[PDB]
């Protein structure tokens, strides 16, 4: 399952190959020196020894031929490992970085990648040093068709182009733009709020500590700003530059954290646009440069596209765009919406929805909840291939409703985070359930039994219980749900308190709590025990329902008032 | 009732007197000129005419004697009016300015005072001009015992000293220091919050527009800072200066509003103090100077002492100190507490308490509410002479309680402002009533009847209803009060809603609302009508009391449960 094992070996092999080369060049100059030594002492005037100086010559030429073969052999294996490193392992990191940012499983450490990039780079610069001591031996001693001279140039050019792009691709945004004051929603930034972003260089060469300075550019190289209509122009406030180093990081990595960076719009002084503000993407790019003796390398990375918003109202709308982006696109195309947004497909939305909950809460969406939502978006066919347009997700109002899909679940999340967390996290809430299934689950259940479900018609995001009562005829019983509770109500008293002291009352009758067992036949106080709040007359504060027309209570008048309704509007 | 009528006349007389003087000096120089004219033409050589030039001489001397008498007569009436103006009318303004700032009736306009100060000052400078044209005539023509020369110096010195202190006393703080973000609580300022203060000069002389610049000094000339132990040292942030003018004001007055002034403490780098922070007073003083041709006047006014606090928690505690100050002291003594704070007396506290409500609300304390509070502080004797120590007001906890008096009423005010305003403002709340009177008012009342009273044991500040039920024996009925409601509860549902849907309930019994009539036999829904809030099952949210042991309801089991208590612990 790990191509890491083979990659470790290749770069091990790379390190192992440069080191023999270094060993063989030492004896190459060792013999180069005694050839000059012998050939010079013999010139200073039957023990021929000219047979030796002819052999010592051939060794030198063979040895030269050998290390030139060994270097090109190495440049050929390192071309193969970098292609893997840069074009597989690193590319896959970046995709699972955009999965992680929007709710996926956590990303691994950059450290395996950094370790790979590093010793490849460390080998790539030892070869540079070897190519240069070979040059020292070439002009101390050359001859016809010197294998040093015949490969000197393209060996030099091959190591650099490799080294150049290697560290060029090493320039990664380790942590994407993210307003700390809004931690769980990166890539969306509000004018006047500071955000942070951390760049990293994976090659980790001590020679580079405090030697690279990164500039931040907003909307660099914009054809879209003057092509697309009404594009908004912004500017970065803060230190636009920062120098990389290794002690600020705790892991010793070479990075440059732009803390305290903020964004404000231009003062151009309105126009219409085919792309609404949250649908409009920008990008934050970064530039640095490696000036060393004789060589110059230009580095340029870019963050994932960001959405900028005017006020916190636009936070959930914007985050839909982020999600649609990193769900589908893997490339920074700032026109991905335009008005060509791809429809997503349920097999992906299905679990990125599940992510929005496990990231916020400690519990994700289950299959039964996913079928519910599936049907709401697609229909009866719960097909993984199901195509979910972007308009049906955040633009057009869902089905026969007056609010879009995503915002309906954002505010459900809101509510769960702020009021329903331990209930939801313990799995007491069967919140995602159509009214059709809702009924069919309780139909053959004890009349004390209920279930908590989220309302599909509350824009502000509410929860409600549904219970079943018997209805003259044994089959086709009576199904009741209370008006669902928004945060306004649960701020005043928690849902577990509401459930326990709920009363159905009626003029001149005993109140009684309809709710007796939660769905799998579990007693109310045994189910919601741990979630309860727990000289004058004490007073408590409770939700109640007056029906307004054991012994006869108010649910006995509830039963009668609804059969009278059912016995009315009968056919004849 | 108005000494204004006589004052208007005196300063009218003052203006009327300078104007005849100006008329008489014109003919004084008119005749001075023809005396020189005749006496010179006669010198240029039986129609004596030396009889004329002897008479014209006597007129001049008499006229001179006359305007010197008329000026000293005026300087004598203006000494009398300024003493009134500066030492009565203005002093009384300043006392009713400190009454107004802390809840008294609104203060009048400075405009009558400004008009007085002005024409007195305008007269005082026309006299200066007259004293100077007299000087012009003196050296054109003098002689033995010239009445001009014999009074010239002290006339000059009398007009200036008068003019000097006149405008010196004209330097008033028109609007006291007051954090706008805390409007109803001036003289208390929090470090880092801007406050405003407006100085005014009442003399209103166009010559002075944009010609006076006022500096603000904090704690100027402090013997107390190094005498009293642990005194805190602060500093003003902002423009410390500002120039007076007349167009910034809308009434055309000469004033200098220090907007955007703020305060921060020193960085001396803890000690103990006999005076706690809110008990510690400071003062903000102001300096300006009148540099005109030949004369220099130094002006120095001071605001009422201010309390500085670290955070809004100290706002109600500090305001007690302000109140105790401007209730008793009329002079800016910054040690008024020290540990010699005077006891206030009920005849004053009584209505300054009533002020705290009519300033906040639209309704003050009534006699019945005042007797209540009187008794709580003093006792059975409701004497106006009653001495109320400062310790019993904000320092030591009231009676057998764990909280001080004043803060108990601040949080009642808080509650009324934030939850009970229209109830309180319509006089539906009999909130100030001991339990003893509370009972004795309902004893002979219908059993549906109740009354709303403030709890005397709620530090956070709560309201509750008390109703009466019949109790086997007709006399000595049953008195019930619910645990009183803090703001936590009334945020969730308003008190009028709580009252209407209040239910006493009990296991297997009908609920019923005990509350049927408010005290003067007024039906619940007819009393609290206007204050009510007014496909699932609807739900509402209501306060209830389970007694936990027409037809038999839950107040019938309430009645039985309390006689069983009363029938228990009986004597034998």
Numbering used by the authors:
A (entry chain A), B (entry chain A): 136 to 180, 192 to 415, 419 to 683, 700 to 714, 742 to 764
Text lifted from the article:
Signal transducer and activator of transcription (STAT) proteins communicate from cell-surface receptors to drive transcription of immune response genes. Cellular, biochemical, mutational, and structural data demonstrate that the repeat region of TgIST adopts a helical conformation upon binding to STAT1 dimers. TgIST binding to this newly exposed site at the STAT1 dimer interface alters its conformation and prevents the recruitment of co-transcriptional activators, thus defining the mechanism of blocked transcription.
Because this structure was of limited resolution, we fused TgIST-R2 to the C-terminus of STAT1. The density of the two loops, which are not clearly resolved in the structure of pSTAT1d alone and only partially seen in monomeric STAT1, are distinct in the new TgIST-R2 bound structure. One STAT1 protomer shares a 551 Å2 buried surface area with TgIST-R2, positioning the helix deep into the grove. In addition, hydrophobic amino acids in TgIST (i.e. L383, V385, and L386) are positioned opposite to the hydrophobic patch formed by F614, W616, Y651, V653, and P663 located at the bottom of loop 1, and L664 at the bottom of loop 2 in the STAT1 dimer. Hence, the altered conformation of loop 2 in the dimeric STAT1 structure exposes a surface for TgIST-R2 binding, that is otherwise absent in the STAT1 free monomer, thus providing an explanation for the specificity of TgIST-R2 in binding to the dimeric form of STAT1.
